[PDB]
Amino acid sequence: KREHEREVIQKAIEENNNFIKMAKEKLAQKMESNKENREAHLAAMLERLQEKDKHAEEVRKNKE
Amino acid sequence: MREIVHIQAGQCGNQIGAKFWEVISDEHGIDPTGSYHGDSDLQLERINVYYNEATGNKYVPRAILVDLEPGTMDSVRSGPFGQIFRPDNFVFGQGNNWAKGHYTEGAELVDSVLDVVRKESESCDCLQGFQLTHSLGGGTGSGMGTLLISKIREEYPDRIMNTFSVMPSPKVSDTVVEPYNATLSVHQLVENTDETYCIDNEALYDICFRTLKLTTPTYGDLNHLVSATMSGVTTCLRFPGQLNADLRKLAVNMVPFPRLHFFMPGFAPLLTVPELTQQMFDSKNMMAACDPRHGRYLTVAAIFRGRMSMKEVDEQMLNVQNKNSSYFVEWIPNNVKTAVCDIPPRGLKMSATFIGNSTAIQELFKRISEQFTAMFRRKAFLHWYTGEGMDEMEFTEAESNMNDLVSEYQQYQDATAD
Amino acid sequence: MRECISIHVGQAGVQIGNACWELYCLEHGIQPDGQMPSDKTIGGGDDSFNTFFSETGAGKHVPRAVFVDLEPTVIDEVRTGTYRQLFHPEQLITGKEDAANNYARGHYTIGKEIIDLVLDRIRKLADQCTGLQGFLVFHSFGGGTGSGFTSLLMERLSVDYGKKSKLEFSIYPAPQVSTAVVEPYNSILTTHTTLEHSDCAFMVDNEAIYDICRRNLDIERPTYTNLNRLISQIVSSITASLRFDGALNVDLTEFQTNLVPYPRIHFPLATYAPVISAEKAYHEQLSVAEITNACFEPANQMVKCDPRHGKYMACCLLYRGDVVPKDVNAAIATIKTKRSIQFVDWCPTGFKVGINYQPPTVVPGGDLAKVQRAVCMLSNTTAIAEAWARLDHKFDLMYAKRAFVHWYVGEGMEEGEFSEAREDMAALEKDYEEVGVDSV
Numbered sequence: 041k042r043e044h045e046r047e048v049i050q051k052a053i054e055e056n057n058n059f060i061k062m063a064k065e066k067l068a069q070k071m072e073s074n075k076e077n078r079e080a081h082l083a084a085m086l087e088r089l090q091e092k093d094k095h096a097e098e099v100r101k102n103k104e
Numbered sequence: 105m106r107e108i109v110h111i112q113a114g115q116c117g118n119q120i121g122a123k124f125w126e127v128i129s130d131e132h133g134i135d136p137t138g139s140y141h142g143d144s145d146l147q148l149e150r151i152n153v154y155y156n157e158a159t160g161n162k163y164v165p166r167a168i169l170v171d172l173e174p175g176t177m178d179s180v181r182s183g184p185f186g187q188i189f190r191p192d193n194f195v196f197g198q199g200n201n202w203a204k205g206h207y208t209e210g211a212e213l214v215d216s217v218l219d220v221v222r223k224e225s226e227s228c229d230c231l232q233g234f235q236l237t238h239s240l241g242g243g244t245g246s247g248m249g250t251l252l253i254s255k256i257r258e259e260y261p262d263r264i265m266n267t268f269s270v271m272p273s274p275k276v277s278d279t280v281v282e283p284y285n286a287t288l289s290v291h292q293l294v295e296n297t298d299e300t301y302c303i304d305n306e307a308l309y310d311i312c313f314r315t316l317k318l319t320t321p322t323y324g325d326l327n328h329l330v331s332a333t334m335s336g337v338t339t340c341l342r343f344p345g346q347l348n349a350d351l352r353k354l355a356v357n358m359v360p361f362p363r364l365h366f367f368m369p370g371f372a373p374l375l376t377v378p379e380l381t382q383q384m385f386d387s388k389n390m391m392a393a394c395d396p397r398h399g400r401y402l403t404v405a406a407i408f409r410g411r412m413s414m415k416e417v418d419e420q421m422l423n424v425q426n427k428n429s430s431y432f433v434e435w436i437p438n439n440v441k442t443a444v445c446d447i448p449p450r451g452l453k454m455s456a457t458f459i460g461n462s463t464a465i466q467e468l469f470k471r472i473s474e475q476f477t478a479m480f481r482r483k484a485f486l487h488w489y490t491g492e493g494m495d496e497m498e499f500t501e502a503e504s505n506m507n508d509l510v511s512e513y514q515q516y517q518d519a520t521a522d
Numbered sequence: 523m524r525e526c527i528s529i530h531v532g533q534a535g536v537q538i539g540n541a542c543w544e545l546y547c548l549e550h551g552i553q554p555d556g557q558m559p560s561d562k563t564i565g566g567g568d569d570s571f572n573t574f575f576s577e578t579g580a581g582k583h584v585p586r587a588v589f590v591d592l593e594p595t596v597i598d599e600v601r602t603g604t605y606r607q608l609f610h611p612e613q614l615i616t617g618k619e620d621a622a623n624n625y626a627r628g629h630y631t632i633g634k635e636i637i638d639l640v641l642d643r644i645r646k647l648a649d650q651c652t653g654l655q656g657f658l659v660f661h662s663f664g665g666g667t668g669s670g671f672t673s674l675l676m677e678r679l680s681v682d683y684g685k686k687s688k689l690e691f692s693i694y695p696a697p698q699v700s701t702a703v704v705e706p707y708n709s710i711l712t713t714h715t716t717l718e719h720s721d722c723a724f725m726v727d728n729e730a731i732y733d734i735c736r737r738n739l740d741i742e743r744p745t746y747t748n749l750n751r752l753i754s755q756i757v758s759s760i761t762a763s764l765r766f767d768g769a770l771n772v773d774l775t776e777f778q779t780n781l782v783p784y785p786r787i788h789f790p791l792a793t794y795a796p797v798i799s800a801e802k803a804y805h806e807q808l809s810v811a812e813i814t815n816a817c818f819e820p821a822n823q824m825v826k827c828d829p830r831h832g833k834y835m836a837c838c839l840l841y842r843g844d845v846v847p848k849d850v851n852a853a854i855a856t857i858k859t860k861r862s863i864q865f866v867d868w869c870p871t872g873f874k875v876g877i878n879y880q881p882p883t884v885v886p887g888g889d890l891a892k893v894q895r896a897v898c899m900l901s902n903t904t905a906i907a908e909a910w911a912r913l914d915h916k917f918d919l920m921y922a923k924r925a926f927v928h929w930y931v932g933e934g935m936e937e938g939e940f941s942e943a944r945e946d947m948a949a950l951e952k953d954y955e956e957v958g959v960d961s962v
């Protein structure tokens with residue numbers, strides 16, 4: 041029975057720790073995934089804007 | 105403080121810009137010298153949204169004045185309140201051609217404008233974004249305004265870009281190249297603004313002639329409508345109330361899809377609370393010359409200004425939606441929202457301003473598409489644009505994107521919940 | 523010991539927090555400067571009110587509270603308001619750019635820039651506690667901060683404070699006073715993300731509170747102040763067993779044991795009585811039998827749903843004022859005969875009763891009559907799932923067209939966070955159905 045008592049309390053510690061680990065890892069992957077996505081969207085906005093600068097150089101060149 | 109930076113471009117931009125600053129300065133108790141002489145402190149709670157603070161408790165509008173033709177600011181400085189504007193925020197050149205404003209003359213001047221934009225922006229606690237007044241039918245406000253948007257957006261990709269865009273009508277101006285200039289501006293607005301108020305000269309004329317009985321309406325009479333509307337649609341940005349709004353909250357709640365961001369403003373009266381409500385949804389009170397019963401409302405924002413029973417406004421706004429339920433898309437629950445502010449505009453004891461994202465706006469764009477193709481097949485006046493280096497593909501694409509926007513507005517007019 | 527730290531998030535949570543702490547100060551005789559002349563224990567003590575207030579050496583009683591908003595406007599009114607001296611400035615935390623009604627900005631874009639500072643401020647409070655029981659989080663479902671920052675915070679609190687108790691007062695959206703068309707999206711996202719991190723959550727439907735002010739207080743068009751004063755009475759009723767002493771006093775965590783049969787089923791329905799105007803309370807005293815009866819009238823619920831067409835898994839009565847067990851037992855006995863109170867087959871039908879003798883307080887200038895006795899019922903009924911159904915429906919109408927989804931995607935979110943959140947809510951509605959089916 042003593043052996044069983046300290047396995048119960050070890051199990052409680054092990055669940056509580058695993059719950060803390062999973063939460064900590066979950067939001068670390070969530071925040072990292074969120075930064076990549078937002079940066080991909082801002083980078084795409086700039087890539088298209090920077091293309092409008094290229095097209096305006098060409099338009100001035102076609103004038104010559 | 106959540107600062108808005110105001111930019112006015114071209115002839116039309118600066119005229120309605122000044123009038124906007126005249127009306128809100130008067131509403132906030134700012135005189136032409138920047139001094140506060142007001143009654144309520146609701147006038148100064150959020151005054152920093154639009155005004156900069158200066159020594160001697162001077163309030164200076166956070167405004168940048170731009171035009172490729174000098175003289176237009178001359179009238180501004182000599183106009184009423186012309187000395188309230190910061191003099192370094194005047195930027196001027198020395199021709200009704202979109203390409204020259206966007207690609208040739210406007211490019212020469214655009215950096216000096218951005219320098220002034222930077223100076224005002226860098227002195228902000230937290231920049232909401234920008235607000236541009238311009239016409240779509242001329243050369244500076246249309247071509248250079250849209251270039252300024254592209255360059256500002258490149259440098260501030262995370263701030264809101266908002267414009268008041270004046271649409272050309274053959275009923276006000278005869279310049280034949282307006283449908284070209286307007287279509288080219290719309291091509292930029294669809295891609296690069298978050299919100300655009302369609303201030304339609306055709307609706308402004310039809311209002312002045314038919315409703316106000318002005319047989320020969322001037323730009324003065326047209327722009328009196330424009331300042332009343334601009335005062336209305338900004339009410340919840342400038343005053344404290346139950347819903348404290350900013351440009352991003354306006355965008356998020358009004359724009360269900362990125363490209364469907366062109367708003368029909370309405371104003372009333374052009375009264376009893378049920379009458380205001382009924383008139384505000386009336387096609388004759390719209391500044392966009394579109395019948396709302398020819399389309400569906402994606403979203404609506406309403407501002408009631410003046411002293412009135414807010415219980416009565418709550419019932420009437422619910423009443424109009426129930427009796428007109430078919431004209432509000434069913435797949436956006438609770439898509440009508442109403443705000444109330446106590447200060448009315450000058451001369452009115454109570455007013456209602458209306459901001460609609462309606463698929464009936466396609467009528468506005470269809471009108472210009474027709475005026476555009478009437479010329480484009482004829483290749484008429486194209487040399488004014490190809491001469492500046494433009495290629496035909498651009499004209500086709502701008503036309504083709506504007507035609508896509510109408511289909512999309514038609515796509516959601518037709519969607520259903522089940 | 524047994525301290526509780528209150529965390530007030532976004533406009534709704536901050537302003538409701540103002541109403542509650544003002545009420546708490548009135549109930550305990552704490553002045554706007556924090557002085558409490560009846561506390562003879564200067565600088566400390568293990569009194570009941572000490573679960574919610576710490577004491578400084580100079581005799582000031584300071585709320586165990588942190589206020590957080592992603593913009594300064596609302597918390598600036600606390601900093602300049604009638605109770606400014608009550609709070610140490612470090613308890614009032616504000617960013618510069620709010621969430622703009624966008625969960626993604628509250629959870630990710632703006633929220634991540636201030637979460638560490640917030641958790642440090644909470645840590646400074648936990649460290650002043652001899653035995654911390656847990657946290658009470660106040661927030662709206664609908665706002666960008668209340669939804670997005672709250673769920674980011676609840677996630678972080680689970681990491682930093684193990685399985686320490688986390689309780690919520692969550693403001694459910696109503697069209698009468700809502701501020702954004704995207705409130706259904708933010709509600710589902712935050713409900714999904716928080717469900718595993720919250721032990722017990724009291725939903726307050728703004729339409730119910732709004733109807734009660736109109737029907738029972740004759741307020742034509744209720745403001746936030748009208749709603750919050752009534753909401754703070756309900757919050758006061760729930761926390762009163764932690765803040766006051768009593769022989770007949772039953773600890774909230776003893777009610778919690780009965781209210782939560784399965785971790786996910788943790789949303790009690792609160793009903794509060796009597797809500798009556800001064801004009802109508804005059805020469806009309808409501809008995810224990812009358813106020814207990816009012817708890818089974820659906821128009822007095824903090825959430826609109828119909829318990830008569832659902833099943834009970836628990837029923838708790840929290841009384842405050844001039845009440846004795848003899849009257850309560852009499853009232854319950856007649857109610858059980860005359861009312862539709864059906865329990866699921868797997869749970870006992872008794873009613874857990876708690877009585878606190880300190881009678882209810884009213885804020886000067888309010889609309890609520892001061893009364894001799896009041897009651898808050900906390901019941902676990904399957905009917906509360908109707909509130910989830912209404913919201914999940916509103917979410918479905920917009921999400922099928924992907925309306926407004928581009929504002930969340932532009933901040934870094936993915937469509938699968940939407941679908942994942944909606945499925946969890948679907949499973950939650952299914953959970954409430956399963957617990958109400960009879961055993962085999």
Ligand SMILES: Nc1nc2c(ncn2[C@@H]2O[C@H](COP(=O)(O)OP(=O)(O)OP(=O)(O)O)[C@@H](O)[C@H]2O)c(=O)[nH]1
Binds near residue numbers: 623669753
């Ligand atoms: N009962 C009550 N509800 C409120 C109050 N203030 C806001 N709400 C509710 O909160 C919802 C919107 O969430 P808010 O808390 O206002 O937004 P927020 O927390 O400031 O987050 P942001 O969107 O970033 O500003 C609305 O639907 C309101 O019904 C209040 O003072 N009392």
Ligand SMILES: Nc1nc2c(ncn2[C@@H]2O[C@H](COP(=O)(O)OP(=O)(O)O)[C@@H](O)[C@H]2O)c(=O)[nH]1
Binds near residue numbers: 277282
């Ligand atoms: N409604 C309105 N439209 C205007 C006003 N001024 C110009 N427009 C329109 O703008 C178009 C010409 O643009 P314009 O102002 O000349 O551009 P700019 O000369 O480059 O600044 C015409 O089609 C007019 O209809 C005005 O004050 N009110």
Ligand SMILES: COc1ccc(N(C)c2nc(Cl)nc3sccc23)cc1
Binds near residue numbers: 702
């Ligand atoms: C779609 O539902 C909506 C529409 C608009 C808003 N907000 C942020 C507003 N913003 C501004 Cl500037 N003015 C006004 S007037 C009434 C609302 C309102 C909120 C919800």
Ligand SMILES: [Ca+2]
Binds near residue numbers: 561567568572577
């Ligand atoms: Ca003490």
Ligand SMILES: [Mg+2]
Binds near residue numbers: 532620621667
């Ligand atoms: Mg806010």
